[PDB]
Amino acid sequence: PQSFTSIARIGDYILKSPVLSKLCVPVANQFINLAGYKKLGLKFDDLIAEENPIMQTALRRLPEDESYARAYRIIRAHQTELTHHLLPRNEWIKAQEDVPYLLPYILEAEAAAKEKDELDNIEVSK
Amino acid sequence: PQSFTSIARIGDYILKSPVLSKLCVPVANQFINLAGYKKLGLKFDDLIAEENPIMQTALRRLPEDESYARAYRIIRAHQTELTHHLLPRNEWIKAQEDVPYLLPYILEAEAAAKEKDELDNIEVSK
Amino acid sequence: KSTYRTPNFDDVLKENNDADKGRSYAYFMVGAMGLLSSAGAKSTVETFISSMTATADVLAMA
Amino acid sequence: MAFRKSNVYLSLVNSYIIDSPQPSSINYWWNMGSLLGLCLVIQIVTGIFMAMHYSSNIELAFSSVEHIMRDVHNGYILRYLHANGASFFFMVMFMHMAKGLYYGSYRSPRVTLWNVGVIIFILTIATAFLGYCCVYGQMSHWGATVITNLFSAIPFVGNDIVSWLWGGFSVSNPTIQRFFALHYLVPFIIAAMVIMHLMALHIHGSSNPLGITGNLDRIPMHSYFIFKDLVTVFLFMLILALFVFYSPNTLGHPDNYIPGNPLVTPASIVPEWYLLPFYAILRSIPDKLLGVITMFAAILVLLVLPFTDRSVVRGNTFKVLSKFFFFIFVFNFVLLGQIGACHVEVPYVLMGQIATFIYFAYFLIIVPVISTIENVLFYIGRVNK
Amino acid sequence: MAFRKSNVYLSLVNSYIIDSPQPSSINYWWNMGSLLGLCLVIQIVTGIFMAMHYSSNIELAFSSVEHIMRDVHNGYILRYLHANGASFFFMVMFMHMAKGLYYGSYRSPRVTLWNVGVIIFILTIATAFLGYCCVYGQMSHWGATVITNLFSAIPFVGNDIVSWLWGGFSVSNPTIQRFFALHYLVPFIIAAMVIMHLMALHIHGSSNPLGITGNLDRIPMHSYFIFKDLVTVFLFMLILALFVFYSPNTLGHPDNYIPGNPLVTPASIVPEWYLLPFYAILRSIPDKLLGVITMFAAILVLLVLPFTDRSVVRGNTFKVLSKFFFFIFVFNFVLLGQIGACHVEVPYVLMGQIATFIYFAYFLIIVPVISTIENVLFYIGRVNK
Amino acid sequence: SSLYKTFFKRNAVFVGTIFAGAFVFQTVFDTAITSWYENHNKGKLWKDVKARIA
Amino acid sequence: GPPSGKTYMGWWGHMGGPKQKGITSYAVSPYAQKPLQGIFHNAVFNSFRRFKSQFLYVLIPAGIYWYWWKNGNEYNEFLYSKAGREELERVNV
Amino acid sequence: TGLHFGRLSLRSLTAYAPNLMLWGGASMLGLFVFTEGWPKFQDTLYKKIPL
Ligand SMILES: CCCCCCCCCCC(=O)OC[C@H](COP(=O)(O)OC[C@H](O)COP(=O)(O)OC[C@@H](COC(=O)CC)OC(=O)CCC)OC(=O)CCCCCCCC
Ligand SMILES: CCCCCCCCCCC(=O)OC[C@H](COP(=O)(O)OC[C@H](O)COP(=O)(O)OC[C@@H](COC(=O)CC)OC(=O)CCC)OC(=O)CCCCCCCC
Ligand SMILES: CCCCCCCCCCCCCCCCCC(=O)OC[C@H](COP(=O)(O)OCCN)OC(=O)CCCCCCCCCCCCC
Ligand SMILES: CCCCCCCCCCCCCCCCCC(=O)OC[C@H](COP(=O)(O)OCCN)OC(=O)CCCCCCCCCCCCC
Ligand code: HEM
Ligand code: HEM
Ligand code: HEM
Ligand code: HEM
Ligand SMILES: COc1c(O)c(C)c(C/C=C(/C)CC/C=C(\C)CC/C=C(\C)CC/C=C(\C)CC/C=C(\C)CCC=C(C)C)c(O)c1OC
Ligand SMILES: COc1c(O)c(C)c(C/C=C(\C)CC/C=C(\C)CC/C=C(/C)CC/C=C(/C)CC/C=C(\C)CCC=C(C)C)c(O)c1OC
Ligand SMILES: CCCCCCCCCCCCCCC(=O)OCCCOP(=O)(O)OC[C@@H](O)COP(=O)(O)OCCCOC(C)=O
Ligand SMILES: CCCCCCCCCCCCCCCCCC(=O)O[C@H](COC(=O)CCCCCC)COP(=O)(O)OCCN
Ligand SMILES: CCCCCCCCCCCCCCCCCC(=O)O[C@H](COC(=O)CCCCCC)COP(=O)(O)OCCN
Ligand SMILES: Cc1cc(C)c2nc(SCc3c(C)cccc3-n3nnn(C)c3=O)sc2c1
Ligand SMILES: Cc1cc(C)c2nc(SCc3c(C)cccc3-n3nnn(C)c3=O)sc2c1
Secondary structure (H helix, E strand, O other): OOOHHHHHHHHHHHHHOOOHHHOHHHHHHHHHHOOOOOOOOOOHHHOEOOOOOOHHHHHHOOOHHHHHHHHHHHHHHHHHHHOOOOOOOOOOOOOOOOOOOOHHHHHHHHHOHHHHOOOOOOOOOO | OOOHHHHHHHHHHHHHOOOHHHOHHHHHHHHHHOOOOOOOOOOHHHOEOOOOOOOOHHHHOOOHHHHHHHHHHHHHHHHHHHOOOOOOOOOOOOOOOOOOOOHHHHHHHHHOHHHHOOOOOOOOOO | OOOOOOOOOOOOEOOOOOOOHHHHHHHHHHHHOOOHHHHHHHHHHHHHHHOOOOOOOOOOOO | OOHHHOOOOHHHHHHHHOOOOEEOOOOHHHHHHHHHHHHHHHHHHHHHHHOOOOOOOOOOHHHHHHHHHHOOOOHHHHHHHHHHHHHHHHHHHHHHHHHHOOOOOOOOOOOHHHHHHHHHHHHHHHHHHHHHOOOOEOHHHHHHHHHHHHHHOOOOOHHHOHHHHHOOOOOOHHHHHHHHHHHHHHHHHHHHHHHHHHHHHHOOOOOOOOOOOOOOOEEOOOOOOOOOHHHHHHHHHHHOOOOOOOOOOOOOOHHHHOEOOOOOOOOOOOOOOOOHHHHHHHOOOOOOOHHHHHHHOOOOOHHHOOOOOOOOEOOOOOOOOOOOOHHHHHHHHHHHHHHOOOOOOOOOOOHHHHOOOHHHHHHHHHHHHHHHHHHHHOOOOOOOO | OOHHHOOOOHHHHHHHHOOOOEEOOOOHHHHHHHHHHHHHHHHHHHHHHHOOOOOOOOOOHHHHHHHHHHOOOOHHHHHHHHHHHHHHHHHHHHHHHHHHHHHHOOOOOOOHHHHHHHHHHHHHHHHHHHHHOOOOEOHHHHHHHHHHHHHHOOOOOHHHOHHHHHOOOOOOHHHHHHHHHHHHHHHHHHHHHHHHHHHHHHOOOOOOOOOOOOOOOEEOOOOOOOOOHHHHHHHHHHHOOOOOOOOOOOOOOHHHHOEOOOOOOOOOOOOOOOOHHHHHHHOOOOOOOHHHHHHHOOOOOHHHOOOOOOOOEOOOOOOOOOOOOHHHHHHHHHHHHHHOOOOOOOOOOOHHHHOOOHHHHHHHHHHHHHHHHHHHHOOOOOOOO | OOOHHHHOOOHHHHOOHHHHHHHHHHHHHHHHHOOHHHHHOOOOOHHHHHOOOO | OOOOOOOOOOOOOOOOOOOOOOOOOOOOOOOOEOOOOOOOOHHHHHHHHHHHHOOOOOHHHHHHHOHHHHHOOOOOOOOOOOOOOOOOOOOOO | OOOOOOOOOHHHOOOOHHHHHHHHHHHOOOOOOOOOOOOOOHHHOOOOOOO
16 A cells, blocks of 8 residues: 555656666566466456455446457466466567556556545634 | 135035035134134235245236235235224224125136146046 | 467376276275275274273273 | 554454443343353353362262251351352353244354354253252162163163163263263363353354344444443342242252152152243153154254344334244243143143154244245235336 | 355355356465365364263373374374374465465455455454464473463563463363363354355455456356366365375374473474474564564555555566565575474574565565566656656 | 266265275275284384283 | 445456556357366476576575575584583683 | 645544544543452552542
8 A cells, every 4th residue: 555646756757767777676677577477368457455444445437348358367376376377478478468458447546535634624714 | 725715615515515514604703803804904815925836827817906905905904003002983893884895717728737737747648 | 360269288188088097097006095985994994993991001900 | 553453362352341342232131141251151150169178979969968058167158059050051152042943043144153052052951960960969870771771772871871871780870970071171161162152152142132234334443342241240240149048948859859869759740840841842752762862852952043134124023923933932931831840640741742753843844835925925015017 | 147146045055156257367376275175164064073982181181182093983183184284284375475475466356355364364364373272282382381481471461471381380181171272262253254255255256367457358256266176175185185094194203202291391392394484583582572573464464465565567467576576585485494393593583584574575675676676667668767 | 987976976876985984994905004003013013022921 | 224434446347456458258058169188388498487486596595594404413413522621611611 | 735634634634633632531531440349550540539
């Protein structure tokens, strides 16, 4: 429970900095391949836990052509685990199609939740 | 569980017999007043247990003007019991309105159940 | 492609699919694993009820 | 929804003792089932504190009960509660089961509720026997001798069952060390049968003194039947106070204050008062195989009552012949208890023989004949034909 | 519907071990929770048969365990099962809890599942202490002396808590007669906490080694995970056979075959092997009030783990820095167990001081710093900005 | 044919003959291991030294 | 019966996932395919491939907690010796 | 607008406090009920001016 608003606040500051993004970005790339989630046929936004009322909002607003192709990547990964093998190298996600398809729907479901509580704990005076 | 069909088979034989119905019918009348169900504002067909699939059939087929007046006689009797009193003698069922309103719907839900089992255990031969 | 084109299962399939071939060897093994579990389970219930008999120093005072 | 119906465990509390729909018409006889949840808590709690000062050897058993009563701080409060409380456990349970066959709840759809209740009554008789053999007084030796000798009448099996039940050749020291270890366990099996007993009630609810359905007028449990509960819980602990502090030895035998001796025999061997009607049934059959069969098939004759009632009305409220035979069965269970504390003499052997036949003619000859006569008398009194 | 989903009690069996929807992906680490239902059945059953031949007095305690081992028929089978089986009870439970913090199941929505599991681990340590004091050997006297002396450090309360825990002025005869009666009861409280533990699992199901949801591909319990269950149950009772019949005294101390003497002291007083890492934490703090606080707040440090994980992915499958710190915590619990069986010497007091700090820096300093670095490294490795 | 319908189809057999075969299993297999134990260890039993003292 | 709060799981028919379209699934009987299939070539190269990924995450935390104990067991073996006489007098007090 | 709360709704700062000074005068007062019969630190109770 760290918040992507806060993840994106820290993450943009490293990417804007030209001297910090020659230290952290190769460490960010070896951490991805050693995670190994691409070999099971999954993007990173599949891995996110969905048991909170913000990720349940960001999944309804997703378009249906993307909502159907994600239910197949999950089922194809549950069967690769059971047989204890890995998928062939023709069915691995490459380094170009691993993009956040869920981060735009997440960041606006959070900013609307940081306005409903700011307007219910408020000290307006005459 | 003593089947109304069988109750009416025995009961008609006493009523047709002119020498048996001078012995059993006064005993049947003192047994009704000593039961005392009329003083609580109830007919006899209210007292019947309804937790079997024949009495659940005979209650759906009942007309709605009679189905509403029976739900009030039950509620008026649950309140007379709680206060430990009895109803006044202007709200007691007399000896003319205590008639079986449910026995026609019961006797034909039973005869249709004694044909579905006779036709499923059958030894027809060529 | 079409749904009327099943994938190949001949890498895992038998070459002579008589029906009684796998209907016998899959009841000899479940038959054998219900025979040792019936003799290896009467002997355990009997060990626990033999302890409530007469103790060895009670049989000496007989 | 509120938190009490959203939580995993609080919604179990909410569905049973807060928002359970009760009928509006039930009277103070539906409270005896609530006292038995308090009666079982008392007997378990006072017994774990008395098990810290007890020695189960046969040469130490009639001195650890006295060490409790003379040396332990408030130890006489613990014992007198655990000896008058078990006789209070049984007076409520005799009134619980007697209500349920008056209002006749054993009927459909509550037959599993009646069948798991007969299992509780068998396991309750067995604990009071096994714990009364742990004092090792004089009634506590010759009561275990007479009962365990009955299992030798089983043909080709007998003398290898008693010698396994005794751990020897008579009521020895291994007999008392195994009866305490089984006295700790069967109260924990009763508590798991009460949890299964409450589950079969949640799907159909309680009955009512009218017999008819009660889904038209209902009241929740909180603020009405909880404050109707506490009227009888404060009356329970007040008569459980007038015994433990003023007459703590009235419900008991003085021969249990002599240590048990396998060589001198008492002039009378009689049970505790709640096993007395079942004692006169065993002594009435002059054979030790047909006597042990008859007394075990007298707790198990309750299971034939769902199949023997031939009436269409539930409960003996408006039934005036089925009410006269309920109060013959009550005073026959009292005459049977009186005879089990008498001598084997004339006429207390023919009186205990007739009155153990009326225990069996009720469930099998008196119920189905009278519950059929009434079905015709409710019919020809109305139908004009 | 069928009869198994229409009955009151069979639908409880059907919803749990027949038609419960399981994920298709779980491996042989989800079987350790099934062995613990068999482990608890063995320890209760073998103990009720051994409680028929036991005397809890302090002058009879180290002779009723030997009367079992030479006079009781197959009595050595009962004891060796109830002394190697409890050490098998703990090796599975250390592997059950270690799985649940690898896959990280403690997270939402399973936090009540993790909180009722910490209560079971406290009550399991307490039974193995109370029953090892019932042998009354030489390790069984000086182990109860050292532990009960810690409760005198509570200011203004201390010497009136130990004298209530002892029933006297040292580890006397009332100390052994109250420790057996509490040894019979707490195994029956664990069984009621396992029933509450299974209820919190039925509403959310199990997790999977991938971490992601598993409502898209499910398999029933019957014919797949029952026949996957019996692979490990036959392996369990086979290594429970190679100890009870071939090396029945390897997991034990030889000083427990000397009767306990309050006048001669052993050259070493060390616990049973599964209380050894918690023994080195108490001895590492040079104060008997700050030492008894630290060892009790080391089983209760597991409750802060739901609030300290800052990651968005569940489980340490794709986390390569959170996997290197899981295997530092494992070999630190082994070095802590080794030091609790050493002498109080150099350097086994500074080694047990550093390694009881790494027990606490994991749950509070190592988890939230590394589970935050990974959230940024999964972000700037993808997002082109 | 003539192997599966012998005693593999019938559950009155498949509850009975898995149980009836255990009766002859607890006598032949029990005797077979209480003759390998003695023959492996002979010369160290009580019956071997009771006949050496005549 | 009273309904309690909703959870993230259902039952057969209403499990509570997303909607699916366009996935096909084939299967063969177990009675129709070979017996004793998965015995060899699993524990030859396949099972050897599995723990080859996860052995540099265990043996590196093992080689530190076994260097540390074996080094401090040759030190509570030298201090209680004869040559460790002047070096025990300074440390313990 | 952007003011004081975390997981608690902190607008109840002293809208929770002065009554649990009196529930603290009802639960530490609850510890003035069960400390009886236990004459160990009940020197901190039995110095009152009546009886
Ligand atoms: C070992 C025993 C431990 C203690 C357990 C006690 C067992 C009680 C079981 C008896 C029972 O429940 O029958 C209820 C029966 C009347 O049936 P009912 O519910 O329709 O009437 C409710 C009333 O009108 C309203 O009663 P109300 O609520 O207005 O006042 C309460 C009343 C006593 O409360 C009780 O708890 C009575 C048990 O207060 C007073 O009377 C003031 C006295 C200064 O009450 C009776 O008086 C009949 C007594 C004959 C029963 C004898 C059977 C013993 C073998
Ligand atoms: C005193 C306690 C005794 C209690 C009984 C034993 C407890 C077992 C606990 C160990 C465990 O559960 O880990 C399971 C893990 C299996 O990994 P996996 O599920 O991904 O692959 C399944 C396989 O591919 C299919 O296995 P398959 O079904 O095809 O064959 C059967 C299997 C034996 O079945 C078992 O029960 C294995 C535990 O054959 C074998 O695997 C040979 C092993 C003898 O095995 C491993 O990865 C090995 C890790 C070492 C364990 C260290 C434990 C430290 C105490
Ligand atoms: C396995 C073997 C089973 C054995 C179980 C049998 C145990 C018998 C022990 C007797 C105790 C049980 C007493 C009866 C309790 C159930 C009766 C009942 O539920 O209520 C019946 C009746 C209710 O009458 P109403 O309140 O409805 O009257 C209102 C008018 N409309 O209530 C009444 O009218 C009150 C009548 C009171 C009768 C008292 C008899 C009790 C005698 C006990 C003697 C004790 C000696 C130790
Ligand atoms: C108070 C609370 C304290 C309790 C803490 C107790 C900790 C010590 C308990 C004994 C240690 C046993 C714990 C090890 C098992 C934990 C469960 C686990 O690690 O998950 C299994 C995981 C499997 O990895 P896979 O990749 O093959 O599976 C797919 C998912 N990634 O991981 C694996 O790779 C398999 C494990 C490899 C074997 C190494 C096990 C540790 C060896 C030391 C055993 C300790 C005894 C000396
Ligand atoms: C349903 C629960 C129980 C019932 C009906 C019951 C009943 C009895 C009875 C009637 C006696 C004889 C009392 C006497 O005449 O002196 C007795 C004795 C005894 N019972 Fe209980 N008991 C129950 C539960 C327990 C439990 C759980 C324990 C656990 C330790 C226990 C411990 C004892 C002991 C130690 C005695 C010894 C004799 C004495 O101290 O009076 N009981 N029990
Ligand atoms: C420790 C023993 C028992 C406990 C805790 C217990 C508890 C309860 C409770 C709380 C009720 C709810 C209705 C009421 O309060 O009257 C009830 C009802 C019932 N009990 Fe028991 N009971 C016990 C023993 C028995 C026995 C021994 C029997 C029968 C042989 C039995 C048969 C019934 C029946 C039939 C009902 C339903 C009555 C109705 O709903 O009208 N119970 N029980
Ligand atoms: C979770 C359940 C249990 C655990 C972990 C447990 C553990 C132990 C252990 C470790 C010992 C010491 C064994 C030795 O070193 O000799 C022991 C002793 C003993 N326990 Fe258990 N126990 C459990 C349940 C029970 C129960 C329910 C009973 C009573 C019915 C019982 C009766 C005894 C007895 C009589 C001894 C006497 C010493 C002996 O015979 O070895 N145990 N227990
Ligand atoms: C007598 C002791 C225990 C029993 C009988 C027991 C039983 C079970 C069972 C049957 C499961 C489901 C099967 C599985 O996940 O392997 C389970 C899961 C679980 N247990 Fe236990 N358990 C016990 C002790 C504990 C302890 C001591 C803890 C934690 C401190 C714990 C925490 C958990 C958790 C978090 C899960 C869910 C794991 C998941 O679903 O991924 N349990 N338990
Ligand atoms: C996630 O999906 C799963 C799942 O994967 C698994 C494996 C299981 C199965 C796992 C289990 C651990 C089984 C459940 C465990 C229990 C029911 C254990 C609790 C029961 C006990 C401890 C019983 C204790 C034993 C007794 C009380 C017997 C007493 C002894 C007696 C009476 C003998 C004395 C008698 C004489 C004459 C001397 C599930 O139930 C389940 O669904 C939730
Ligand atoms: C009809 O409507 C009703 C209804 O009227 C009632 C009353 C209830 C209430 C339910 C009951 C009364 C059931 C009663 C439940 C029990 C009796 C279970 C209790 C069982 C136990 C084993 C409790 C005892 C447990 C212990 C741990 C004993 C305590 C021993 C201790 C604390 C050891 C002391 C030593 C030290 C060192 C502290 C309903 O649920 C209900 O709805 C159906
Ligand atoms: C092969 C594997 C091994 C085989 C295993 C067999 C199958 C395994 C499945 C396990 C089944 C576990 C299911 C759990 C269970 O039994 O649920 C509880 C039963 C429901 O009844 P209940 O509500 O508990 O009882 C009724 C109870 O809820 C009564 O509660 P109440 O008394 O109202 O409140 C408490 C008192 C509070 O009072 C106060 C203080 O006000
Ligand atoms: C069937 C026999 C088993 C024994 C009896 C079964 C249970 C009967 C009731 C017993 C009393 C239980 C009442 C406890 C209420 C506690 C509230 C709660 O659970 O909050 C829990 C957290 O509790 C825990 O951490 C574990 C507590 C262990 C409980 C051990 C007694 C959180 O509740 P929840 O997460 O549902 O709230 C979300 C609201 N949106
Ligand atoms: C025990 C801890 C509580 C935790 C939850 C409870 C878990 C349930 C345990 C599983 C029990 C399995 C029972 C399946 C068979 C039930 C059949 C049935 O509905 O019987 C009912 C009533 O009988 C019973 O009360 C038996 C209850 C079983 C309790 C065992 C002592 C129908 O009875 P029956 O079919 O024999 O016809 C009447 C002829 N006398
Ligand atoms: C099903 C069943 C089971 C049992 C076990 C049982 N037992 C008895 S009568 C025992 C007895 C006698 C004969 C004489 C003196 C005293 C005691 N005695 N023993 N325990 N209690 C409380 C006693 O009164 S009928 C009965 C029926
Ligand atoms: C929370 C908690 C509770 C308890 C009760 C506890 N107890 C110990 S250590 C006891 C001990 C010593 C110090 C020395 C020799 C033998 C034993 N001993 N006693 N029982 N067992 C199995 C032993 O090994 S830590 C711990 C932690």
